[PDB]
């Protein structure tokens, strides 16, 4: 069935790129099935997005690309965890919507943070029994109305670092928005053209 | 009163190991054949029994 899986996967992708000559490529992060079903539920009305073996998409466009010419530039442009997302609309239609519905899937132990998020000074709102996170991390929080409260401008995370164990486990309970990411678009291909 | 994270480290060097059935040697848990000559490098290996 594996060979028929390979032959079928070429057939569906080649009837989808020929359907949508305006083809965009996107690079997915290590995201779960919910966010794949999120983009599936958010886009299936007029389009579809698929995931598969990266070499397979190149082979589907290596010699079998000859159905429509001027598509040959896609071979040295598909590297890493990237695929093909197909849509009929203009450049600005999908870029702003796909980059706005980013799911804040929180920070795992060992996640990169290119975005700067700083904890402000406010009342946290949870119980007065988990002060060990703040005291060990270097933050002095005083009990007001039986609640933890940040009383000073304290750094939380830098740029280009790796989230630690104590840095992430307090981030989950604190209910403060961390760095966000998702199905970030690489570039476009509007019938023999490449744009940002 | 050993907290579990240090408890697991101790059990790595003391319990998480394979035992040769023929010569009673102590082998790393991923071993396939015993490293000792006198057992003939046999393959009959069993996990070390626990305390439970």
């Amino acid at each position: 069935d594996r060979a028929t899986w390979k032959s079928n996967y070429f057939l569906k992708i080649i009837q989808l790129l020929d359907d949508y000559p305006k083809c965009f490529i996107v690079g997915a992060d290590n995201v779960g099935s919910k966010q794949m079903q999120q983009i599936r539920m958010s886009l299936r009305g007029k389009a579809v997005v698929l995931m598969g073996k990266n070499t397979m998409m190149r082979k589907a466009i290596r010699g079998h690309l000859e159905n429509n010419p001027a598509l040959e530039k896609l071979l040295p442009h598909i590297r890493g965890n990237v695929g093909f997302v197909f849509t009929k609309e203009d450049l600005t239609e999908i870029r702003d919507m796909l980059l706005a519905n980013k799911v804040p899937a929180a920070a795992r132990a060992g996640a990169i943070a290119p975005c700067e998020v700083t904890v402000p000074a406010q009342n946290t709102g949870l119980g007065p029994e988990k002060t060990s996170f703040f005291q060990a991390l270097g933050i002095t929080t005083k009990i007001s109305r039986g609640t933890i409260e940040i009383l000073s401008d304290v750094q939380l995370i830098k740029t280009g670092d790796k989230v630690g164990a104590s840095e992430a486990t307090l981030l989950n309970m604190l209910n403060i928005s961390p760095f966000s990411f998702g199905l970030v678009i690489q570039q476009v291909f509007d019938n023999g053209s490449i744009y940002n | 009163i050993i907290e579990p994270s240090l408890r697991q480290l101790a059990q790595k060097y003391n319990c998480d190991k394979m035992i040769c059935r023929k010569c009673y040697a102590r082998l790393h848990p991923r071993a396939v054949n015993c490293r000792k000559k006198k057992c003939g490098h046999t393959n009959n290996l069993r996990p070390k029994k626990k305390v439970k």
Binding site: - | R7, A10, Y13, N14, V51
Partner: protein, 190 residues
Amino acid sequence: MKTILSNQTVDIPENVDITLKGRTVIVKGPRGTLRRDFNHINVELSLLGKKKKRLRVDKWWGNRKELATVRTICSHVQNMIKGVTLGFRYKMRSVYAHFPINVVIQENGSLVEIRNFLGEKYIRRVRMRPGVACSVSQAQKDELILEGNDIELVSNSAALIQQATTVKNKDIRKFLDGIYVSEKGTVQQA
């Protein structure tokens, strides 16, 4: 079957230089100097890089037994390069049930005293290898830090400490006491 050639090339960072005398490797880096010979293995050592310092080892007409030595040397050279630029730091954790392990560091961190292992009055005196520095960390409640240039000496020194604290005539599965190595880290974290 005898393979004609089984080469393997390692890369030397520019901050460290290597001078080869016969089959003796001399590594001179920021953290110190390391010498180790390989006369017991019949290999050819060549320095490719006058520009980026590629080091190549070659074996001609070898059988399956002796092609394994080719990368064995290569790992050793990488360990030497790692030591002279980063250094090897070993963390050992002392675990106990009722008798807390007391550790006293002697002169220059070259001698370690273990006092009350399993609550016996015997005093254990374990001597580290030369060039290996041991210390009691301030990071955690029970941690011993072993820093030295050679992974050969450091890990051997740490294992001596661990093997010394060995329970006898008891169920080792239940009696979990003893100093065990936790992680094999580096220094300067570069």
